Design a protein around this nucleic acid. Structure first.
Ligand SMILES: [Cl-]
Ligand SMILES: [Cl-]
Ligand SMILES: [Cl-]
Ligand SMILES: [Cl-]
Ligand SMILES: [Cl-]
Ligand SMILES: [K+]
Ligand SMILES: [Mg+2]
Ligand SMILES: [Mg+2]
Ligand SMILES: [Mg+2]
Ligand SMILES: [Mg+2]
Ligand SMILES: [Mg+2]
Ligand SMILES: [Mg+2]
Ligand SMILES: [Mg+2]
Ligand SMILES: [Mg+2]
Ligand code: NA
Ligand code: NA
Ligand code: NA
Ligand code: NA
Ligand code: NA
Ligand code: NA
Ligand code: NA
Ligand code: NA
Ligand code: NA
Ligand code: NA
Ligand code: NA
Ligand code: NA
Lengths: 172, 142, 156, 29
RNA sequence: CGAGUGGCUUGCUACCUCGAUGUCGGUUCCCUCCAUCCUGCCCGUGCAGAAGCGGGCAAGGGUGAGGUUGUUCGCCUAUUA
RNA sequence: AGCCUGUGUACCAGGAGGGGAACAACCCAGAGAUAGGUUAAGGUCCCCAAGUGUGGAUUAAGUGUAAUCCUCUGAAGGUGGUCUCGAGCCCUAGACAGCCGGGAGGUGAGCUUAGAAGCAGCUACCCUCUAAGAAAAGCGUAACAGCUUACCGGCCGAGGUU
């Protein structure tokens, strides 16, 4: 098998060994694409993913490599953004960005601030009760969004009743 | 310090067992061997199981004792000893004329023995002796 | 008591009631189920085939049968289908319940000897195989692994 | 060779006389 | 109803010891197993909360004092995570 | 049951030597001494004599590297883990999936019921417009609304489905 991904005019993609880097007006993302007998190479205007095998396990990764690359194309041009909404019922939850980590205070009345560190070059811009996680590395952005939501996780009590927390409102 | 090796073998990206089997055979033929870059030697398989085996060996023991190495240094050497009759005169001689090293203290670059190299491009399930030692608790002195 | 004790056909055939007394009654309720008024005039005919020779105690027969027919009420108490269990527990079974002295056991039950590949059950249905499910439940209560086989039915 | 498709290409050609692929079909007639 | 795992109970067998391998219980002192009682981290709930019930990972540590009985076991009391 | 008790046979007992990690009866083998040679069972990555042998395929579990067996467990049941072979049906007159658009009216059918309008229950389930569209397959409402399946069209482009 072999698949050819024509790279966008807006982008440049270089690759040495098992590492591929993609640079666009929005940034640069480098990934490792390592799997038995699957070669990834930049042939001038197109990135090539090929292998001499066609077994289910191989095809699976090939398809995965593809989406991973295309996702990088998209991240260096249009970028990736996740929209989130802080929400509380009794205690005013305060979500702030301090340093390279978003901090949340007064969660359900907690005295101890809950926090999480942002992944990579992900921007977490907060405006009122709305948050916007964005960056060129979908991996990083996606996690930072997630981590933020996970950060208000509650196991001790009935979630249906204690719904406070920040949630992913719009997935790219 | 200073070891007149008739042969210097480079373990980097080689199957430990296959290297050892050959280093054993040569030492018994009278050759003085030195294994280099042990920390970069490799063993195929699911890292989770592999590590369980070596962790078990560390835990095994009693007053009589079962001293099992944690550094990629000894791990490799113990592997070789298992392929020599180290309790016989001949065996102990052969074993003692073989030493394993972390990295390469020589000037010459060791040679790669046939059939012992692992192609990283067509293999994802394998582990580095160094990785194992770090898991075991060794002090990464390399 | 476990099937482990009687599932094997390693003992001589022991069925002569003229020389054996005190044989427990069978727990199997019926052998003909459904519309026994009608004859096999159905489009589809599925069978449950035993894949290993074994002895099946009337215990398992009743449980296997009930579990299947009781379920075949996905068609209704008076549904259109007929169910048949073609085997009967002829083999009398003993238990030595003195230690190994005078150990010829006493009659404790009956079992049916089935040979690998025979069909123990046979159902007759119109293209409405809810029976295929009645059987997944039946071979669930008998010792051997089994094959659910469909004969007259090229309506796949 | 679906028949309903064959009949449509006809009915279409009929109104043309007095799916896109089916229209393009009739047009080719 | 069917299929199993363990080798703590009970039974079976009579392989080992009758030129003897000292009994039960207790005690003291050491190691271990996990099928987890508590503790840590979790899932479900007929999960509002609190208090529970059930389940998963998990053997690091803990699992105590007494009344009857030689008892093992067990019954009983007050403490206890 | 490494149980008890028959039977036929070969073995141990009273049978070496080779192999099986060890091991009365499993395998080769029945054996005077000494010597050369070739095999048997079994084995040829090292320990350990002989292949890191050849053509091809499978397995990712260290499954396995365990003829036989008190000794080497692993079952019923289950598996879109993966590989191989077959049959039927659908498809460039554009299939399968996804996304977009359409899902219309007589009409909120009749009946019952204050009520019931696709969807409490009962009966029926007709015809119009049309490229589609049930007298409604599933949610939802006090009943409506709302959200979708069926059904049609578009985008897409290659196998798909049982
Ligand atoms: Cl020790
Ligand atoms: Cl030795
Ligand atoms: Cl691999
Ligand atoms: Cl002889
Ligand atoms: Cl292993
Ligand atoms: K004795
Ligand atoms: Mg609570
Ligand atoms: Mg003594
Ligand atoms: Mg456990
Ligand atoms: Mg402990
Ligand atoms: Mg004798
Ligand atoms: Mg040799
Ligand atoms: Mg194993
Ligand atoms: Mg066997
Ligand atoms: Na290995
Ligand atoms: Na040890
Ligand atoms: Na007696
Ligand atoms: Na079964
Ligand atoms: Na058992
Ligand atoms: Na004695
Ligand atoms: Na004692
Ligand atoms: Na513990
Ligand atoms: Na007491
Ligand atoms: Na003899
Ligand atoms: Na031997
Ligand atoms: Na193994």
């Amino acid at each position: 098998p072999r698949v050819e991904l024509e790279i966008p005019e807006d982008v440049d993609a270089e690759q040495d060994h098992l590492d591929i880097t993609v640079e666009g007006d929005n940034g640069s993302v480098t990934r490792r694409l390592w799997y038995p007998d699957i070669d990834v190479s930049v042939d001038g205007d197109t990135v090539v993913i090929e292998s001499d095998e066609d077994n289910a396990k191989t095809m699976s990764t090939i398809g995965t490599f593809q989406s991973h690359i295309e996702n990088m194309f998209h991240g260096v041009t249009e970028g990736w953004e996740y929209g989130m909404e802080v929400f509380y019922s009794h205690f005013p939850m305060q979500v702030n960005v301090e340093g390279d980590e978003v901090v949340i205070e007064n969660f359900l009345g907690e005295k101890a601030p809950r926090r999480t560190t942002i992944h990579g070059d992900t921007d977490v811009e907060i405006d009122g009760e709305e948050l916007t996680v964005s960056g060129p590395d979908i991996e990083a952005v996606g996690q930072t969004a997630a981590d933020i939501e996970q950060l208000t996780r509650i196991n001790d009590k009935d979630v249906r009743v204690f719904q406070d927390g920040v949630y992913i409102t719009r997935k790219p | 310090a200073e070891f007149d090796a008739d042969v210097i073998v480079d373990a980097r990206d080689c199957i430990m067992g296959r290297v050892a089997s050959q280093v054993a055979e040569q030492a018994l033929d009278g050759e003085t061997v030195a294994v280099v870059n042990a920390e970069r030697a490799v063993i195929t398989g699911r890292e989770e199981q592999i590590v369980e085996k070596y962790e078990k060996r560390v835990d095994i023991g009693n007053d009589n004792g079962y001293f099992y190495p944690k550094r990629p240094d000894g791990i490799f050497k113990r592997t070789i000893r298992g392929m020599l009759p180290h309790k016989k005169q001949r065996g102990r001689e052969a074993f003692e004329s073989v030493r394993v090293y972390l990295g390469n203290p020589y000037d010459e670059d060791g040679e790669v023995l046939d059939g012992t190299s692992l192609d990283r491009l067509s293999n994802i399930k394998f582990v580095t002796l160094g990785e194992i030692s770090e898991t075991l608790g060794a002090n990464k002195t390399w | 008591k476990p099937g482990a004790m009687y599932r094997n056909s390693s003992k001589p055939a022991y069925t002569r009631r003229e020389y054996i007394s005190g044989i427990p009654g069978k727990k199997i309720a019926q052998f003909d189920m459904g519309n026994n008024g009608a004859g096999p005039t159905y489009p589809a005919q599925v069978e449950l085939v035993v894949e290993k020779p074994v002895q099946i105690r009337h215990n398992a027969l009743e449980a296997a049968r009930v579990a299947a027919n009781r379920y075949v009420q996905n068609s209704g108490a008076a549904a259109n289908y007929k169910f048949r269990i073609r085997k009967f527990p002829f083999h009398v079974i003993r238990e030595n319940k003195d230690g190994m002295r005078a150990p010829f056991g006493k009659p404790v039950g009956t079992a049916a000897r089935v040979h690998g590949a025979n069909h123990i059950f046979i159902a007759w249905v119109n293209p409405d195989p809810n029976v295929e499910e009645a059987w997944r439940r039946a071979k669930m209560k008998v010792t051997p692994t089994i094959n659910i086989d469909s004969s007259p039915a090229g309506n796949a | 060779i679906p028949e309903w498709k064959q009949e449509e290409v006809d009915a279409i050609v009929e109104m043309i006389e007095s799916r896109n692929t089916l229209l393009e079909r009739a047009l080719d007639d």
